[PDB]
From a paper:
Many bacterial and eukaryotic viruses with double-stranded DNA genomes in the realms Duplodnaviria and Varidnaviria encode homologs of cellular RNAPs (collectively denoted “two-barrel RNAPs”). The TMP-fused virion RNAP transcribes pre-early phage genes, including a gene that encodes another, non-virion RNAP, that transcribes early and some middle phage genes. Transcription by vRNAP and nvRNAP is directed by dissimilar AT-rich and GC-rich promoters, respectively, and the two phage RNAPs have distinct overall architectures, with the TMP-fused vRNAP being unusually flat and lacking the clamp domain.
For structural analysis of gp96 vRNAP, the shortest gp96 fragment possessing the RNAP activity was delineated using a fast cell-free assay system. The shortest fragment of gp96 that retained RNAP activity encompassed residues 327–1124. We crystallized the 1–1200 and 327–1124 fragments and determined their structures at 3.1 Å and 4.4 Å resolution, respectively. The structure of the 1–1200 fragment was largely the same as the structure of the 327–1124 fragment because most of the flanking regions not essential for the activity were disordered, except for two helices at the C-terminus (1125–1162). By contrast, the virion RNAP adopts a unique flat structure without a clamp. In contrast, gp96 vRNAP contains no defined domain at the corresponding position, resulting in a clamp-less, flat structure that heretofore has not been observed for any RNAP. We hypothesize that this unique structure enables the passage of gp96 vRNAP through the narrow channel in the phage tail. Gp96 is exceptional as it lacks the C-terminal region, and its connector element, which is disordered in the gp96 crystals (gp96 613–679), is twice shorter than in QDE-1 and phi14:2. The disordered region is likely positioned close to the RNA-DNA hybrid duplex during transcription elongation and might dynamically interact with the nascent RNA strand, moving similarly to the clamp domains of other RNAPs. We hypothesize that the vRNAP is associated with the pore formed by the TMP in the bacterial cell envelope and transcribes pre-early phage genes concomitantly with the phage genome translocation through the pore.
Numbering used by the authors: 327 to 612, 680 to 742, 750 to 812, 821 to 1117
Amino acid sequence: NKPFAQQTGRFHTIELQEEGSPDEFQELLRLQASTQGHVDETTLARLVVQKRATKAILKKLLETADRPEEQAVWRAAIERLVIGNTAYDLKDDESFAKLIELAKKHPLEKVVKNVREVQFSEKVTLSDKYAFVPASNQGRIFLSHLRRENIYRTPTQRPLSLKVAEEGEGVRLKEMEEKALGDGALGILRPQSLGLPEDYTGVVQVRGELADPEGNVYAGLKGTVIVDPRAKEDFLNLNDLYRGDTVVDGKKYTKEEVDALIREKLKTGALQLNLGIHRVSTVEEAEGQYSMAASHTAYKELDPEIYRLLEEGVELDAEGRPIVPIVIGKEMAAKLGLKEGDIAFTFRNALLQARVAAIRDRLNAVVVNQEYAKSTGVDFDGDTLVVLPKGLPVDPHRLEVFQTLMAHAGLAVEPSPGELRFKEQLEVYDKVLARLSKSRLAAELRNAGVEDLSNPFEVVRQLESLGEEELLKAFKGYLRKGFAKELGLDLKSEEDRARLNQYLFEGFLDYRKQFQDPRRVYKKLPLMPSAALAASLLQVEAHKKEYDPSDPVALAAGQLTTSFLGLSEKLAQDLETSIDFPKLAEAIRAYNQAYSSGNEEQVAKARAELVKVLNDPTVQKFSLSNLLYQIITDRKKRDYSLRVRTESGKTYEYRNLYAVLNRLMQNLPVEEVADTVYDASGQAVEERVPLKQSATRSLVKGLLDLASG
Ligand SMILES: [Mg+2]
């Protein structure tokens, strides 16, 4: 309903961009359009962030001359302020008295357009939309500025207060593997513990903090918990909460250093959990219906059948379209007309075929294995998986297709075949089949309608389909004598005999209910050679770097540079209408075939043809656009950069992605707007960044007082 900075009282909040006012950053962005990309985007963002914040902190410092002891927290949001020639160290009762003095005697905006410097406290956390400051300086808050912005800016409804204790009644804090319950998940608790309607069973997205009475908060959690009355204890996984990696009172408390303070506080029964709900997972329509996604890894404990179902692999169909196992609930299965075994389709709000492996009574999530849906990038912190009925009124794309493009855009890299889930079993079955296909029994089967004896899951299915109970006892009995043979088990020993039926049926034949062909079900999905090829033709990667954790402008300034993600998206849409998906799919399917069991000639010619399609400008720009969309989205957390290795052997690095976005658009060479260039192995040949910055601050000061005489 309202932001978590206000619903808990930790931070006071002020707005950075006022009521519908013009976006002054979008207007500076055509200085880059005029100059053809020789000003710095992140420098322009800083000037905007420093003006909006200086105007907002000030507008509060006067409206709070009447709430004076609430003003003192906004005082320590600016240390020193240079206005004209005088300097205001706000820590002084003297300078701050003078600061509020000229405040009233002079008007707004135009006066702000006349400060020179500004330095912010470590207390203030700047973002693209707000500025946060802790309510009480008494306590201390043990998480970095990015995690404050990640956790406390999200709107949640009224927060709860759950006890944290190891023994007795409360929430326990287990120390498991990181992401053990899934990436975006961070705990399992019951519906009745956070006040949900009786025996709710799904997943809910929360924004909790872990505090003590004295106002200190040691960890903040961002992500989802799994709600289910079937688990015993409300428990939170410590290693999935944001903790440490910040500076309190001059010292840097690492992730491990804060973990000890909690273990000490948790032992003393003086540790709570202030948690707020952001969205409870319903099953709602979209045709199609959708709900949140949960990892199968978080049902290991409770309802293990869901886990074991989705852990035993995925299978590629006859055309190469992977069919992923999901687990849905009663409401969704009804509205989408699906029962167990049905094939459907699913996507995150890439499109994959889905195999219903189970249906639950009260579930309202879409439980999937995540390693098999990495092609649709499902992160379990509130991503909604849509499911569609069995009608299949569309062409689902083939594994080689999107895994290759995803690789040509550096979002995946070597050609590796998969891991056959039934490798050892099918070997043993093929040795028996050499003898079975010769036997009279094989003729009995082919006379009853079962002519292809190569698929064990089909012969057993096609037999119990059309009666023939006796021709199934003989088949199940022949494979017993054959496998006991082939594995050296004595069919008489009643424990050795119990090992046959434990390997042949339980471990193999019983899985005919989930999979069609055991020869096409994998445990680790392969990497098609066209994808390994496609990733060596475009040498594009997304380089990771953290925003300056000491300067609060760096994050907010970085988040402003995200306000043109839409132009990155239109470029992708406007580009994919050109690429002939028919020719690309056949060009890929040809190379993967000629690679696997092709002659020495075609592995060369199929390579040279696919290479010329991927060195094509329309294709290269579409994949490069797809990369920029991910980089821009990620820059809302870190100072990510683009890196490209060209035919010169050099590698170029970019942090002016709008200029890059312009150069791709009008089909211009993109190397001039770059920020730094490297010499293959050697590095830092041109450092263009310092020049673009001071010229930006110069061309700014020019454009300003020139429009004002
Ligand atoms: Mg997500």
